[PDB]
Design a binder for this molecule. Structure first.
Ligand code: FMN
Ligand code: FMN
Ligand code: NA
Ligand code: NA
Lengths: 179, 179
């Protein structure tokens, strides 16, 4: 199922841990794990992402200007941590971790089938990439696995500790300024 | 209880909704609600924050270069939403909502007694404030209410819907790259 990209805040504002899927100029796919990210703007949908030169993935991001933010659920927690503790420079992470790359619509980086949400992104502003390792991304497309049985997101609290989403609390009726 | 400011990630990486406390040049305290933020750097501890001109609080941020990020818990959810739907141009929100200002150590913006964590911040880089309403903050001090019984954080999913923290996973043993 597809969501309009303006819906990005509804997926990312809450600060889930995410995977960043890339594909190098060489055609090889990779994954890394990212907890330093923000929504920047609702419409157009802009995301701020920290991806530094300590990541092999930084090369593909730099060179190609594309990625997919693949949003995992609680059942993938060990895979997500492990992805964040090894490098794709010499390991096939999709293969190793039993994840399935799926073609994206607007980018050459793959979607991750096992992730509940996949947000196709382009690098729109690299102005602060050198300064802060900050990349401004615009969400192009959003794909949701609406059939998925487990849908709880997890959030990194540092040091490999994660909160698992529990109760949902809907205070929409109080959002009088934001209709 | 005080934490070294380098600990900021352990508070903010998970993407809790936060209150932004300011004090204007005229001496009036205020609060606003913010969901568009991220950690940018562990050490020195840098935070990226979206605070736009639609917020009265933008004036104090510009004019004083100081704030406190006050991190609420689930028991404050309605108040957090309400704070985000009115303006301090014409209201004393601390008084109106029954929150208590406490003097900070390094800034003139107050801490919020009822919030679990309070991170004193200075604006270090306003280079992208006009561009994106983005402010780079450096955490100066961290205070934690270590006695508080309710400590579950809430995460905004947009439109006044929040996830409430559930269980914590501790996968620290797997953080082999990040000791
Ligand atoms: C939970 C967690 C969060 C992470 N957050 C970030 C991040 O925000 N930015 C970043 O550049 N690296 C982050 N990392 C580190 C990268 O995921 C890690 O360096 C990874 O091994 C890079 O893979 P690569 O070399 O294949 O690109 C994180 C790791 C973990 C486990
Ligand atoms: C849950 C929620 C999240 C919000 N996130 C942001 C944000 O990230 N940045 C922002 O500038 N305003 C945000 N707002 C809007 C401000 O909180 C709102 O405009 C507030 O009335 C400003 O108060 P002030 O005029 O006293 O500064 C948010 C509001 C709510 C309720
Ligand atoms: Na292409
Ligand atoms: Na965030």
């Amino acid at each position: 199922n597809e969501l309009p990209p303006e819906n990005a805040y509804r997926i990312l504002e809450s600060g889930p841990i995410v995977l960043v899927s890339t594909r190098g100029a060489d055609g090889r796919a990779n994954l890394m794990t990212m907890g330093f990210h923000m929504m920047m703007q609702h419409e157009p949908p802009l995301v701020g992402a920290i991806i530094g030169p300590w990541d092999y993935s930084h090369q593909a991001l730099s060179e190609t200007g594309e990625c997919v933010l693949a949003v995992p659920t609680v059942d993938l927690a060990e895979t997500v941590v492990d992805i964040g503790n090894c490098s794709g420079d010499a390991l096939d992470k999709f293969g190793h971790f039993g994840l399935t790359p799926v073609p994206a619509q607007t980018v050459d980086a793959p979607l991750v089938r096992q992730c509940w949400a996949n947000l196709e992104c382009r690098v729109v502003d690299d102005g602060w990439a050198r300064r802060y390792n900050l990349w401004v991304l615009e969400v192009q497309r959003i794909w949701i696995d609406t059939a998925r049985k487990e849908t709880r997101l997890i959030h990194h609290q540092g040091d490999g500790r994660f909160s698992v989403d529990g109760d949902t609390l809907d205070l929409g009726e109080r959002m009088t300024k934001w209709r």
